[PDB]
Amino acid sequence: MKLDMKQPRKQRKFLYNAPLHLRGKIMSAPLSKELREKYGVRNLPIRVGDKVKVMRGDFKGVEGKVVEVDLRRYRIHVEGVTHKKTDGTEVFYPLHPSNVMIVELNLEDEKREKIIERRA
Amino acid sequence: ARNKPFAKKLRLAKAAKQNRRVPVWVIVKTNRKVITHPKRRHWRRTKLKE
Amino acid sequence: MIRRRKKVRKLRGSHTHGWGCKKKHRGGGSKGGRGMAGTGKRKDQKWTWTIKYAPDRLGKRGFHRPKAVQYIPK
Amino acid sequence: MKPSEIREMSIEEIDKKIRELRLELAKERGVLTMENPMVIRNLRRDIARLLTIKREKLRE
Amino acid sequence: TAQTREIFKKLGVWDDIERAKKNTKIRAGKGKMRGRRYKKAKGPLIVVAKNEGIVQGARNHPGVDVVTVDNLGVEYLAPGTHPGRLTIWTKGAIERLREIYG
RNA sequence: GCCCCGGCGAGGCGCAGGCAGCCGUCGAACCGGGGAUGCCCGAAUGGGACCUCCCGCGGCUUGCCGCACUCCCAGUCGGGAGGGGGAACGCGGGGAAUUGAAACAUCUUAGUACCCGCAGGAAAAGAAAGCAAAAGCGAUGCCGUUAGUAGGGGCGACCGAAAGCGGCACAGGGCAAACUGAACCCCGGGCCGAAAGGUUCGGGGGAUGUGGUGUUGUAGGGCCCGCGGAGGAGCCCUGGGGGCGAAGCCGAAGUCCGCUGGAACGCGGCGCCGGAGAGGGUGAAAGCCCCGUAGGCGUAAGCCCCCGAGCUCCUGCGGUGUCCCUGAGUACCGUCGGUCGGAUAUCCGGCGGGAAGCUGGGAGGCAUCGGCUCCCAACCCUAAAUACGUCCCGAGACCGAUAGCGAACUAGUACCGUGAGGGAAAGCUGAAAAGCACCCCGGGAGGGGGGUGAAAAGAGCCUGAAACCAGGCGGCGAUAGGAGGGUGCG
C-alpha cells in the first residue's frame, strides 16, 4: 500500500476501513531462521494450516496449529491457547500475528509458492 | 363502508408494519447497543400525516 | 525588541476598563454624531473644535489646471 | 446449479426449469410459516441465473 | 551512513549525536493528536559548498543538518533563538564565505 | 443482488460481538473494466386525476410497437430539435426600506437585499471611426501602483475613476458589395475504400443569386495592361518505434541474556541496519515484531510524439487608368426620463427631426472658424494568462463531546405547526467475555453465600468532584437576643 501520510487520523482510518484484499498483508507473521534460510524470505502472511510458536504474552513457548483467521478483527486462533469459562468449557484466546513466529509452513497451494518466488 | 382511497390505504399499511420493537437477537448480536429506535408511534399520542 | 503586553490583561477586574461611569461608553451619542457630524454648516456641537484646530476645511478657494497642461520642470 | 451446466441446454429446458423452481419456492414459502433455512435464497438466485442466461442466448 | 558514523567518531561529535538521540522525548499535550509526538533534539550542522552524496549520507543521524553556504539562514545557526551551534565547515565553504562576505 | 474478462491468493455471508445454515480451490469475498434486470409518481409526454391511482385507441402476432405540445426539413411517408435539474463562480433586465447625515426633503443606505429571464465547465470581452501630444504606442482580459488623486456633492455627510508605468500570458481570422452567373449545397438508395472522401440513379433547395472572387485609409479591393504558374498544408490509419499512463510488485536490520510486572514497547547489559531514526499498529514509552518509509519496479486499455500509408480545393508578382465598391431611420441636433467621478465635457432608452456616402467620412473634455495629429463606425467568429469548489487530495502556533459544522451516533432524524416553515438530545467494560457455574430465601424485580479477573471495572460498566440525603463518631444541646463574624482568655 501507499501510506505516506504523517497524519494519525488518516493512518487509523485506512486501517479500520481497509478493503478485504489488503488485510492478509496487515496480518503477516515472521519466519524461523531455518525457513528464512531455505527460502530466502523474512515474513509471510498467515494461514490456517500453519504451525506457529507464541513469542509474547502469557502463552509463551507454546507451539501449535492455526485453526482460525479473522480479518474483520485482526486476530487468529491457535490450538492449545485456551482459557476456561465459569461453567468449565474451553474457549480460544485470540492473538495478533505479530506476537507469533512460523516454524512450519503449509504449502498445498500454488499461489503461496508464487508469493515466495516473487519475493525471494 | 368507510371509503378509503387505495393509495392512502397502502401508506397506512406501511405505517402499521413499521411499528414494533427491536428484535431480541439483534440486541444479542450487537451486545446491548441497539435497543430502541426512533419510530415507536402510538395511535393516541403522536398522529401521522394521513 | 521591546514586546510589552496589552493592557486589557491588566484591566481584568477593573469593571469599567478605563471608561469611567458605567453609562459613558455607548454608541454614536457618546461621540456626538458619527464621523465629521456637527462640524458646522448645519450643526455646531463640534464648531469650537473646528475653529481652533481645522479652519479651511469648510469652504472653497481657487482653481486647478489640467495635468494635460501642467508642466513640472527639473 | 452452475452456469456451465446451464449453458449446455436449450431454452425450453431452461423454461421448464424456471416453472419447476417457482413452484418449489411457493411451496417452501408456505411451509416456512408452519433444516437448511437457505433454500429460499438459493432458489431465488438460481431463477435469476437462468433468466440472465436465457436473455443472453436470445440476444444472439 | 556507516562511513559518516566512523568519520564523526574520529572527529569527536558522536557524543553530541548520542545526546540528541537520548534527549528526544514524547511531548506533553494535545500535539500528540495532531502529529507532533516526539520533540526531536538538535545536533551538529555540516556546511558544505556543493552536495555530491553527503546529504544522502548524513541525513539519518539524529539532530544532524546539512546545508550549502548559498542557502544558509539564521534558524540553522541559532535554534530557539539561542546561538552557539556545533558546526563542521568545509574549506570550500570557507572560501565561498570569503567571497560572499556574509 | 445476476453474467463475463483481468488482478489478488483463502476465506467469505453491510452498520452489527446471535441461533440455524449456505457459498468458495472448477480461483469466491475484495479491487479495475464492461454488460443485463431495472415497479409507481415525477419535464412526465396516448387521455384523466379529492389522495404516487385509474381509463382508452390502433395495428402484429396472450405476447408486442406506436398514439403529447411548440417548432425546422419535408409531405400526405417519415427524419430531427426543445421542455426539467445543478452549491458557488457567469451574462442580461426589474428594484426597496431600516440606517448615516447627531431632526430631515437633494444626498446616503444601493444599482444593495429580494424578484424575472438565459448559459457553461468556465462565462463574458476581444483585433482601434482607439490612446496620445512637438515623442510616440499598437487586439482583449488579470495582478501591483497611479490615488483617497482628477473630479462629483444641502461643495455637507460622504462618494470616487482612467490613461500612463512595472509584470503574467500572447494570435489573429471571416462576411456584405463591386466582378462572374449554376461552374453549387443537403437527404436516400447502387458501388470503392481504414479513410480522408470519390462516383452513379431518385428526390429537396437555389436567378428575390448556390458556388468562385474579395475584406482595407487618401487607402484597400475589383476591372485593365502585362511578366510569372512550389498551396501543399492538412486529414485516414493495414503498417512502426518511443513515451505517458493502473488496479498492482520488491523493499534493510535483535523478539539476544537478567530484574519488575497480568502483559515489556520499562530498567540494566551486549549487538546490528541505515538513500530507510516520517507516521501508525501490536496486552506499558519499539529504527531492528508488523504495515509501511527512503528508494528501486512493471504495466492492458486510453492518450501524445514522430516515419511512412491513401487521398484533397483555389492559386503569384509590377504598375496605369476622369472606370466600379467599401454596412441608414444609422452618424448628427433638440427635448424628456434614468444612470455616471464625468463636471456647459459619461453611458442607456423614449419622442420629434434627420445626412454625406470615396471630389467621401469621424475624433482630439463648452460652442464654433482655421491649421496639425490620429483613425474608417453603423455585420460575424476567436485559445492562453482569470473566477468557483455541491466533489477528491494533502497539510495545520485550529476544536477536543456545554467545544468543534446543527449533526463524532439508526440527523436536517425524532418531534411541533392547516401551511409557508421551525427543529433536539444522545461518545469511552476489560489484554481477553474470561459477560458470574453451584447452594439457601423471595410471587417476582432481587438479596445473601460462592466464583472470573492484575484489578468488579458487572453492561444501571474508565476516572467519578460539588451541591443534596441517610447512618455512625466527636462537641454543644429546653431562663434564652442579633447580618451568623473579629480580638483576647478558658
PDB file of N, CA and C (backbone and C1' of nucleotides) in Angstrom, chain E residues 1-2 5 14 21 60-61, chain F residues 252-254 271-277 287-288:
ATOM      1  N   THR E   1      25.956   6.011   5.399  1.00  0.00           N
ATOM      2  CA  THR E   1      25.703   6.431   6.771  1.00  0.00           C
ATOM      3  C   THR E   1      26.716   5.832   7.738  1.00  0.00           C
ATOM      4  N   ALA E   2      27.162   4.603   7.485  1.00  0.00           N
ATOM      5  CA  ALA E   2      28.158   3.983   8.354  1.00  0.00           C
ATOM      6  C   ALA E   2      29.528   4.641   8.203  1.00  0.00           C
ATOM      7  N   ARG E   5      29.353   7.646  10.148  1.00  0.00           N
ATOM      8  CA  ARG E   5      29.488   7.244  11.542  1.00  0.00           C
ATOM      9  C   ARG E   5      30.948   7.205  11.968  1.00  0.00           C
ATOM     10  N   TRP E  14      30.385  12.359  17.802  1.00  0.00           N
ATOM     11  CA  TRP E  14      29.487  11.242  18.041  1.00  0.00           C
ATOM     12  C   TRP E  14      28.775  11.363  19.377  1.00  0.00           C
ATOM     13  N   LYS E  21      20.074  11.715  20.420  1.00  0.00           N
ATOM     14  CA  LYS E  21      19.242  10.519  20.451  1.00  0.00           C
ATOM     15  C   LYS E  21      18.646  10.272  21.836  1.00  0.00           C
ATOM     16  N   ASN E  60      20.257  10.711   8.108  1.00  0.00           N
ATOM     17  CA  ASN E  60      19.501   9.919   9.067  1.00  0.00           C
ATOM     18  C   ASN E  60      20.033   9.967  10.497  1.00  0.00           C
ATOM     19  N   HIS E  61      21.129  10.623  10.755  1.00  0.00           N
ATOM     20  CA  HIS E  61      21.610  10.717  12.121  1.00  0.00           C
ATOM     21  C   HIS E  61      20.755  11.710  12.916  1.00  0.00           C
TER      22      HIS E  61
ATOM     23  P     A F 252      13.474  -5.937   3.393  1.00  0.00           P
ATOM     24  O5'   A F 252      14.862  -5.920   4.176  1.00  0.00           O
ATOM     25  C5'   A F 252      16.099  -6.130   3.504  1.00  0.00           C
ATOM     26  C4'   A F 252      17.243  -5.457   4.223  1.00  0.00           C
ATOM     27  C3'   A F 252      17.391  -5.799   5.697  1.00  0.00           C
ATOM     28  O3'   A F 252      18.182  -6.957   5.889  1.00  0.00           O
ATOM     29  C1'   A F 252      17.444  -3.447   5.410  1.00  0.00           C
ATOM     30  P     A F 253      17.632  -8.207   6.729  1.00  0.00           P
ATOM     31  O5'   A F 253      18.056  -7.870   8.223  1.00  0.00           O
ATOM     32  C5'   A F 253      19.420  -7.681   8.557  1.00  0.00           C
ATOM     33  C4'   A F 253      19.591  -6.678   9.663  1.00  0.00           C
ATOM     34  C3'   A F 253      18.894  -6.994  10.972  1.00  0.00           C
ATOM     35  O3'   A F 253      19.641  -7.868  11.802  1.00  0.00           O
ATOM     36  C1'   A F 253      18.487  -4.740  10.359  1.00  0.00           C
ATOM     37  P     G F 254      19.042  -9.280  12.282  1.00  0.00           P
ATOM     38  O5'   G F 254      17.892  -8.914  13.323  1.00  0.00           O
ATOM     39  C5'   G F 254      18.177  -8.186  14.511  1.00  0.00           C
ATOM     40  C4'   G F 254      18.025  -9.021  15.756  1.00  0.00           C
ATOM     41  C3'   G F 254      16.596  -9.383  16.154  1.00  0.00           C
ATOM     42  O3'   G F 254      16.574 -10.697  16.708  1.00  0.00           O
ATOM     43  C1'   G F 254      17.637  -8.247  17.929  1.00  0.00           C
ATOM     44  P     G F 271      29.528  -5.480  22.683  1.00  0.00           P
ATOM     45  O5'   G F 271      28.202  -5.399  21.808  1.00  0.00           O
ATOM     46  C5'   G F 271      28.251  -5.138  20.412  1.00  0.00           C
ATOM     47  C4'   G F 271      27.305  -6.035  19.659  1.00  0.00           C
ATOM     48  C3'   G F 271      26.905  -5.586  18.263  1.00  0.00           C
ATOM     49  O3'   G F 271      27.879  -5.866  17.272  1.00  0.00           O
ATOM     50  C1'   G F 271      24.978  -6.224  19.451  1.00  0.00           C
ATOM     51  P     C F 272      28.145  -4.817  16.082  1.00  0.00           P
ATOM     52  O5'   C F 272      26.780  -4.787  15.266  1.00  0.00           O
ATOM     53  C5'   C F 272      26.525  -5.760  14.271  1.00  0.00           C
ATOM     54  C4'   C F 272      25.115  -5.701  13.750  1.00  0.00           C
ATOM     55  C3'   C F 272      24.818  -4.640  12.707  1.00  0.00           C
ATOM     56  O3'   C F 272      25.236  -5.012  11.404  1.00  0.00           O
ATOM     57  C1'   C F 272      23.091  -4.684  14.322  1.00  0.00           C
ATOM     58  P     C F 273      25.654  -3.895  10.331  1.00  0.00           P
ATOM     59  O5'   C F 273      24.275  -3.245   9.880  1.00  0.00           O
ATOM     60  C5'   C F 273      23.311  -4.008   9.178  1.00  0.00           C
ATOM     61  C4'   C F 273      22.129  -3.184   8.756  1.00  0.00           C
ATOM     62  C3'   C F 273      22.431  -1.889   8.029  1.00  0.00           C
ATOM     63  O3'   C F 273      22.702  -2.093   6.655  1.00  0.00           O
ATOM     64  C1'   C F 273      20.750  -1.532   9.663  1.00  0.00           C
ATOM     65  P     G F 274      23.404  -0.952   5.777  1.00  0.00           P
ATOM     66  O5'   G F 274      22.531   0.345   6.052  1.00  0.00           O
ATOM     67  C5'   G F 274      21.325   0.578   5.345  1.00  0.00           C
ATOM     68  C4'   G F 274      20.601   1.784   5.860  1.00  0.00           C
ATOM     69  C3'   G F 274      21.290   3.112   5.631  1.00  0.00           C
ATOM     70  O3'   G F 274      21.073   3.597   4.325  1.00  0.00           O
ATOM     71  C1'   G F 274      20.566   2.987   7.864  1.00  0.00           C
ATOM     72  P     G F 275      22.297   4.077   3.412  1.00  0.00           P
ATOM     73  O5'   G F 275      22.152   5.658   3.464  1.00  0.00           O
ATOM     74  C5'   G F 275      22.085   6.413   2.274  1.00  0.00           C
ATOM     75  C4'   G F 275      20.765   7.117   2.083  1.00  0.00           C
ATOM     76  C3'   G F 275      19.525   6.401   2.611  1.00  0.00           C
ATOM     77  O3'   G F 275      18.538   7.350   3.027  1.00  0.00           O
ATOM     78  C1'   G F 275      19.382   6.613   0.264  1.00  0.00           C
ATOM     79  P     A F 276      18.291   7.668   4.582  1.00  0.00           P
ATOM     80  O5'   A F 276      17.097   6.705   5.012  1.00  0.00           O
ATOM     81  C5'   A F 276      15.749   7.154   4.943  1.00  0.00           C
ATOM     82  C4'   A F 276      14.750   6.116   5.389  1.00  0.00           C
ATOM     83  C3'   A F 276      14.847   5.668   6.848  1.00  0.00           C
ATOM     84  O3'   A F 276      13.546   5.335   7.343  1.00  0.00           O
ATOM     85  C1'   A F 276      15.090   3.809   5.447  1.00  0.00           C
ATOM     86  P     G F 277      12.645   6.370   8.179  1.00  0.00           P
ATOM     87  O5'   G F 277      13.631   7.030   9.242  1.00  0.00           O
ATOM     88  C5'   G F 277      13.980   6.361  10.448  1.00  0.00           C
ATOM     89  C4'   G F 277      13.958   7.282  11.634  1.00  0.00           C
ATOM     90  C3'   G F 277      14.684   8.607  11.441  1.00  0.00           C
ATOM     91  O3'   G F 277      13.969   9.655  12.099  1.00  0.00           O
ATOM     92  C1'   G F 277      15.616   7.455  13.278  1.00  0.00           C
ATOM     93  P     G F 287      12.795   2.690  18.636  1.00  0.00           P
ATOM     94  O5'   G F 287      13.143   2.559  17.091  1.00  0.00           O
ATOM     95  C5'   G F 287      12.262   3.049  16.093  1.00  0.00           C
ATOM     96  C4'   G F 287      12.705   2.642  14.711  1.00  0.00           C
ATOM     97  C3'   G F 287      12.978   1.154  14.505  1.00  0.00           C
ATOM     98  O3'   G F 287      11.830   0.452  14.060  1.00  0.00           O
ATOM     99  C1'   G F 287      14.854   2.424  13.799  1.00  0.00           C
ATOM    100  P     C F 288      11.321  -0.888  14.787  1.00  0.00           P
ATOM    101  O5'   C F 288      12.494  -1.940  14.574  1.00  0.00           O
ATOM    102  C5'   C F 288      12.510  -2.763  13.422  1.00  0.00           C
ATOM    103  C4'   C F 288      13.727  -3.646  13.338  1.00  0.00           C
ATOM    104  C3'   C F 288      13.817  -4.784  14.337  1.00  0.00           C
ATOM    105  O3'   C F 288      13.011  -5.885  13.949  1.00  0.00           O
ATOM    106  C1'   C F 288      15.922  -3.702  14.134  1.00  0.00           C
TER     107        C F 288
END
